[PDB]
Amino acid sequence: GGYTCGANTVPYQVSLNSGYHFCGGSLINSQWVVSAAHCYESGIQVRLGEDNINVVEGNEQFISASKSIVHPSYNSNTLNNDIMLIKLKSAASLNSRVASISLPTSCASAGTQCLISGWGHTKSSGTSHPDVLKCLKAPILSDSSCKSAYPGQITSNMFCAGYLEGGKKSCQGDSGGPVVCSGKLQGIVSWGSGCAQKNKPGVYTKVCNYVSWIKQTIASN
Numbered sequence: 001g002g003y004t005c006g007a008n009t010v011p012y013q014v015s016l017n018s019g020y021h022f023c024g025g026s027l028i029n030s031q032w033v034v035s036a037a038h039c040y041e042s043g044i045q046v047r048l049g050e051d052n053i054n055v056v057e058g059n060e061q062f063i064s065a066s067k068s069i070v071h072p073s074y075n076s077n078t079l080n081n082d083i084m085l086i087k088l089k090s091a092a093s094l095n096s097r098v099a100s101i102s103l104p105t106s107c108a109s110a111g112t113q114c115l116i117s118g119w120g121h122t123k124s125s126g127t128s129h130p131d132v133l134k135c136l137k138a139p140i141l142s143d144s145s146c147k148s149a150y151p152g153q154i155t156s157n158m159f160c161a162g163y164l165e166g167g168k169k170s171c172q173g174d175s176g177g178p179v180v181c182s183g184k185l186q187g188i189v190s191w192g193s194g195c196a197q198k199n200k201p202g203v204y205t206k207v208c209n210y211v212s213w214i215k216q217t218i219a220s221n
């Protein structure tokens with residue numbers, strides 16, 4: 001059923017704030033964040049080093065976004081290619097509590113354990129959530145199990161993680177938040193019934209498919 005992460009124990013976890021916390025993201029180098037395309041908005045401030053999003057606790061860095069880049073093939077209806085890059089106006093100061101997470105070299109496999117983290121804010125859902133960072137350890141599901149859970153909706157750019165039994169709900173991730181497996185950012189919180197229904201997995205953007213695009217885009221902007 002997940003747990004309270006602990007302050008600054010997930011040092012790559014970002015809050016995106018446009019007046020309020022509206023999405024999560026992952027710091028992938030000192031000047032770039034990975035989030036979901038469905039998180040796209042104007043006037044983004046990136047907030048690093050957060051634990052309680054409503055209290056200044058001493059390790060925060062607030063940096064305005066320079067621009068956001070939604071994936072060229074993002075479809076807002078199907079959520080295929082649900083990935084967006086956010087450039088920071090200035091480089092974050094990296095330390096133990098604020099640190100980047102590595103992009104994957106290879107995709108992850110079913111059965112691999114991942115860490116999903118966030119404040120539980122899903123964009124435009126209206127759902128209640130806590131103010132401190134929450135965590136869930138969950139396994140990647142097989143392609144076949146994922147497709148069986150969501151018939152007609154899982155593309156090659158998506159994967160499922162979570163639990164099909166237990167009677168729990170998984171509401172930890174924010175829209176756009178990290179799914180980190182063996183020290184690599186493998187997923188982005190995208191969609192699913194995992195919070196609304198018990199025994200359903202989350203659906204995540206498959207980051208390994210996008211590494212070339214991410215690297216090329218950063219290198220040119």
Ligand SMILES: [Ca+2]
Pocket residue numbers: 050051052053054055056057060
């Ligand atoms: Ca804070």
Ligand SMILES: [Zn+2]
Pocket residue numbers: 021120121122129
């Ligand atoms: Zn919220």
